[PDB]
């Protein structure tokens, strides 16, 4: 019993974190086998961060311009290339701590753990979600670029996020591990703004199911709704549309609790209109949307 924002154990990722320095710029790198992955903005100069020409900047670099430090050990860079917004530094040593891993590009609404690091060393681990507007609501300071987000379902570390920048609203933007940004963002300090964010409806419903599984039913009601009527209401509260895919995805939690998906939708409609009137759900006084249907099953009985 209980329900917490639960991250994956971070040790498999901790053993991959390194510090990358180029000139006076330092950030974190991800050392897997004999490649160190890091944001290509490590090659920018403090002067030209509005319109860097990364191809031009990279061709002026030698392998020995990259200082890569794993703990107190300096790794020798023997090659380098750029893939989209990520730099790949080939090193002469394969990381003996490399876990089984893969790279995955996630969809908005998906969650993952973040190992926030500075100077190649971990500071903490927390759960995050890819927002509908392709930002993440992280906790990151200067020097955190190159920190990664990941899941570890079963034995395999799936890397899905590498941190690059902070937007003016204080939320974050970054790439997959192939260097493609999530969202319309670019690795430039030019003015960029996150679009309006919305609530991840299928996650809210998953979390209400977690509440019922943990023995709370006060917010259920006798009503059901249609999918289209629910979406008309949900939009008015800046909730994401619920698709038939989402309905299908909730099938398991629906079976475990005996509450049909569209019955739970009618309960969410009423919660949006009434609020919680001083009660809480799973210890929260607002509707939580960073637990996926899969997360709930992972955590609950």
């Amino acid at each position: 019993s209980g329900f917490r924002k639960m991250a994956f154990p971070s040790g498999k990722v901790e053993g991959c974190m390194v510090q990358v320095t180029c000139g006076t710029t330092t950030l974190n790198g991800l050392w897997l086998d004999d490649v160190v992955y890091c944001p290509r903005a490590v090659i920018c100069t403090s002067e030209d961060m509005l319109n860097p020409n990364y191809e031009d900047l990279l061709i002026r670099k030698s392998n020995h311009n990259f200082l890569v430090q794993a703990g107190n050990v300096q790794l020798r860079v023997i090659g380098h290339s750029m893939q989209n917004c990520v730099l790949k530094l080939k090193v002469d040593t394969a990381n003996p701590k490399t876990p089984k891993y893969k790279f995955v590009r996630i969809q908005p609404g998906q969650t993952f753990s973040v190992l926030a690091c500075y100077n190649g060393s971990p500071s903490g681990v927390y759960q995050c979600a890819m927002r509908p507007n392709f930002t993440i609501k992280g906790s990151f300071l200067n020097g955190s670029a190159g920190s990664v987000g990941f899941n570890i379902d079963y034995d395999c570390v799936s890397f899905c996020y590498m941190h690059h920048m902070e937007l003016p609203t204080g939320v974050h933007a970054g790439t997959d591990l192939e260097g493609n940004f999530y969202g319309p963002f670019v690795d430039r300090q030019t003015a960029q703004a996150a679009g309006t964010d919305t609530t991840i409806t299928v996650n809210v419903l998953a979390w209400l199911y977690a509440a019922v599984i943990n023995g709370d039913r006060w917010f259920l009601n006798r009503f059901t709704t249609t999918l289209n009527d629910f979406n008309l209401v949900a939009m008015k509260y800046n909730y994401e549309p619920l698709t038939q895919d989402h309905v299908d995805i909730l099938g398991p939690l629906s079976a475990q609790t005996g509450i049909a998906v569209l019955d739970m939708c009618a309960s969410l409609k009423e919660l949006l209109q009434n609020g919680m009137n001083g009660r809480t759900i799973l210890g929260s006084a607002l509707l939580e949307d960073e637990f996926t249907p899969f997360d709930v099953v992972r955590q609950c009985s």
Partner: peptide, 8 residues
Amino acid sequence: GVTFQSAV
């Protein structure tokens, strides 16, 4: 107000 989060 967009900031790379490297450190310098």
